[PDB]
Design a protein around this nucleic acid. Structure first.
Ligand code: MG
Ligand code: MG
Ligand code: MG
Ligand code: MG
Ligand code: MG
Ligand code: MG
Ligand code: MG
Ligand code: MG
Ligand code: MG
Ligand code: MG
Lengths: 127, 95, 53, 287, 55
RNA sequence: ACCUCGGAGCAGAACCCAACCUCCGAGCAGUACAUGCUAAGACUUCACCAGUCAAAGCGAACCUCAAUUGAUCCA
RNA sequence: CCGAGCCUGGUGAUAGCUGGUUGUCCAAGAUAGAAUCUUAGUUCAACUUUAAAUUUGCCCACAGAACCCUAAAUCCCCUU
């Protein structure tokens, strides 16, 4: 109907079809997600670790031993985030933390090791 | 202060307070503390940081300049790349 | 005219500077200082005078 | 009602039976008598009653408060600073539920301001309207919203439901006609062609992440994929629905309306639309 | 103002809900506004009068 | 003769208190160069201008004296 | 009626200074000080007034508030 000299077809002739503008890991259907509020909306993600086939074997148990705190009794890893009021942004940094966890898996503590050394030098005892 | 002009008969704002102060829509006014660009060598670190920090204004001197300014400067302005957007509104204010 | 105020400049070319007092008779001084940009103690040399005190 | 059955029995209303609401018009109090007349509320003796008081903000020779404070770059170039009015997708969901703006057609600033969604004051230097992340929940618009500025969450929420977002810059006199074209149609001149963005906002309107109308269409699938990868939501390919053509309806630069174009003069009384049909005039309006 | 569409699902998003029809027989009734909203409003006065009104 | 600032008595005991009332002083000096950045909470020379104290955190090591001085524009 | 004439006009010049400011009736109500080419004035403070939001306000009981160099008191303070 009307095409200017700065039109899309004139600026970039590589793309002509309007359908080209709308062409096409972490399976959401496998994951379990819930939401609540406490004034910020919290997003709680849960999923079974050992059942995730999209994660490889060495990465899976690595997350298990390094993040022993968050695993549930039933075997599901639980994760929460309530920084923002937007559940989408809550779901955003949730999977970002999961992405940061698998990447590093594929790759006061000063006081703690002191007492462990104190405990080790205390137990010189034979049967 | 110049209540009615001669060419249109309207209030006239002096550009002094424009350069010195800034408005938040709640009715608050801030300012840079004076003496922050003179004789910094003799001042202790606690003093110069107190001068660098902004400071609000009393209700009286705020009301005084509010009488001076006109309604154009009191409107709501939605600036971009403006850190004062969080502060134009007020939250959790009782009495 | 006992003391003199002098500025010093970062030798790394960052442009960080400050001032301190100095005696009119004492020779040039070179001292360390914590540059906020380089973020560690680094030597500054003072160049000229600003005012007497 | 209990109000009207009193008036039929009560007498007829006239100027003599007329009276305002008590408490509205308080009586004027003039300085004549014993109470006010003596001094009329001006003080005993001094500039207060003599009328030679100093100006406002004078400290009797002492430096006023407004000069002792130093100058700082608070509001410099405020008549050229970047301004845009907010718009929340909560309101967009609200307005479509009211039915003033139809989601069946492409939404636009014209359809918006014709709906009185938000006022706009182009002579107060606001070059459009921005989307606001407040309202991410309860949003099923599916509209092809036209906007100037856009947030990341707003684009993700709109694209998740199948809508379309796109930025389109307008000049000052190109925008006031956009938000209100009919008075220019009472003038009869040809509608003016749009311009490119200014010498600083071009990186914004050329980027693909913010849906720039100068950006390529080939890069929008990539930006859509990253947002779906970012905020964890399925990416509905909108090519399937029957109204996919409607969703992709967009205006090229130097054109205001999808139908009209620069140079096209429009008339309402004895409705007619006219062209120049001159080579020199036509080839410039395209430019 | 156009009469809004008859949504198949209620309550409509954005907390909107049109009035029930027929109305309830009562000694009174509260009508909606031009935008078919509830005529309940807020107001501040004297800096401290923190009230709400119905019209 | 004085015009600013600090200390003592008048003002004995939370605070403040003047007199062309009685005394002693100041307009510096010395040592570091983290005399770096930020931050809770409070006082305040009876207003304001100013002047003050500072937890904690980042980053590091392992200030004394009492006044000891000066706003805005402008350069 | 010349330390510089008289007339008009600018001019209703300006004057922190004096002079005076019109009907009736009622309530509340004199209040530390700082700065100023400032002390015959003005801005702020404090006091006073109006219309309101909220809850503590006042009197205050044991305890508590310096060595230096023996006063009437004072500050704070739950109860009442
Ligand atoms: Mg007087
Ligand atoms: Mg008189
Ligand atoms: Mg005068
Ligand atoms: Mg109102
Ligand atoms: Mg005080
Ligand atoms: Mg600390
Ligand atoms: Mg004569
Ligand atoms: Mg006069
Ligand atoms: Mg009385
Ligand atoms: Mg009590």
């Amino acid at each position: 109907e009307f095409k200017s000299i700065y039109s899309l077809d004139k600026l970039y002739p590589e793309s002509q079809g309007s359908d080209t503008a709308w062409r096409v890991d972490i399976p959401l259907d496998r994951l379990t997600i819930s939401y609540c509020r406490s004034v910020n909306s919290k997003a709680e993600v849960r999923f079974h670790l050992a059942t995730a086939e999209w994660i490889a074997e060495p990465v899976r148990q690595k997350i298990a031993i390094t993040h022993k705190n968050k695993i549930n009794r039933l075997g599901e890893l639980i994760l929460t985030s309530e920084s923002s009021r937007y559940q989408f942004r809550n779901l955003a940094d949730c999977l970002q933390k999961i992405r940061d966890m698998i990447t590093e898996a594929s790759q006061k503590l000063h006081r703690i090791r002191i007492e462990n050394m104190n405990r080790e030098r205390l137990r010189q005892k034979r049967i | 202060l110049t209540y009615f002009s001669a060419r249109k008969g309207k209030r006239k704002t002096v550009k002094a307070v424009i350069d010195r102060f800034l408005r938040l829509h709640c009715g608050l006014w801030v300012r840079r503390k004076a003496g922050y660009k003179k004789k910094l060598w003799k001042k202790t670190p606690a003093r110069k940081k107190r001068l660098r920090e902004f400071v609000f204004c009393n209700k009286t001197q705020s009301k005084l300049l509010d009488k001076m300014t006109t309604s154009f400067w009191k409107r709501r302005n939605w600036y971009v790349d403006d850190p004062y957007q969080k502060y134009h509104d007020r939250t959790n204010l009782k009495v | 005219s006992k003391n003199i105020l002098v500025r010093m400049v970062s030798e790394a070319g960052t442009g960080f500077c400050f001032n301190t007092k100095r005696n009119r008779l004492r020779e040039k001084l070179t001292l360390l200082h914590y540059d906020p940009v380089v973020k560690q103690r680094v030597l500054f040399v003072e160049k000229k005078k600003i005012r007497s005190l | 009602a209990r109000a009207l059955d009193l008036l039929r029995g009560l007498p007829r209303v006239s100027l003599a039976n007329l009276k305002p609401n008590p408490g509205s018009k308080k009586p004027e109090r003039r300085p004549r008598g014993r109470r006010r007349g003596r001094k009329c509320g001006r003080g005993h003796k001094g500039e207060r009653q003599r009328g030679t008081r100093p100006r406002l903000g004078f400290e009797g020779g002492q430096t006023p408060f407004y000069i002792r404070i130093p100058k700082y770059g608070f509001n410099e170039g405020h008549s050229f600073r970047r301004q845009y009015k907010p718009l929340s997708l909560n309101r967009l969901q609200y307005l479509i539920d009211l039915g003033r703006v139809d989601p069946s057609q492409p939404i636009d600033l014209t359809q918006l301001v014709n709906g009185r969604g938000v006022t706009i004051q182009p002579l107060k230097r606001d070059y459009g309207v921005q989307l606001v992340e407040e309202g991410a929940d309860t949003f099923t618009a599916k509209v092809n919203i036209e906007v100037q500025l856009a947030s990341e969450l707003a684009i993700a929420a709109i694209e998740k439901n199948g809508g379309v977002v796109t930025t389109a810059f307008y000049d000052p006199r190109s925008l006031d006609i956009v938000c209100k074209p009919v008075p220019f149609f009472l003038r009869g001149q040809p509608i003016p062609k749009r311009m490119l963005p200014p010498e600083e906002l071009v990186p914004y309107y050329t980027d693909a992440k913010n849906r720039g109308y100068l950006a390529d269409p080939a890069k929008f699938p990539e930006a859509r994929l990253e947002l779906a990868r970012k905020y964890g939501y399925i990416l509905p390919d909108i090519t399937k629905d029957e109204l996919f053509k409607m969703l992709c309806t967009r205006k090229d630069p130097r054109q205001i309306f999808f139908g009209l174009a620069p140079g096209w003069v429009v008339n309402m009384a004895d409705k007619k639309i006219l062209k120049p049909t001159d080579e020199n005039l036509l080839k410039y309006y395209t430019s | 103002i156009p009469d809004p569409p008859k949504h198949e699902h209620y309550p409509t998003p954005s907390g909107w809900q049109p009035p029930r029809d027929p109305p309830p027989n009562l000694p009174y009734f509260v009508r909606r506004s031009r935008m078919h909203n509830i005529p309940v409003y807020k107001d501040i006065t004297h800096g401290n009068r923190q009230m709400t009104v119905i019209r």
